[PDB]
Amino acid sequence: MFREVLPKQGQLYVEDITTMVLCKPKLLPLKSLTLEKLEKMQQAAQDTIHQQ
C-alpha cells in the first residue's frame, strides 16, 4: 500500500529565447443556408452542362 511520490517542483524558464512560432489552429467557419443554396445551384448548372 505505497503511493508513488511525485516531484512538487516544475520546470521554470530562466530566459526568453526567440523561437519560430507556428500558425494557429483554424476553426472552419460554418455556412449559411443561402450560401449553400447558391453553391449548389452553381454546381447543378455545371452538372447539367456536362450531362447533356
Binding site: M20, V21, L22, C23, K26
Partner: peptide
Amino acid sequence: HAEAYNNLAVLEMRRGHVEQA
C-alpha cells in the same frame, strides 16, 4: 495554404534545414 507553409517551415528549422524553412 500559407499556414501549412509556415508551420512546416517551423518544423524544418526545428530539424535544422534553414534554407528549406
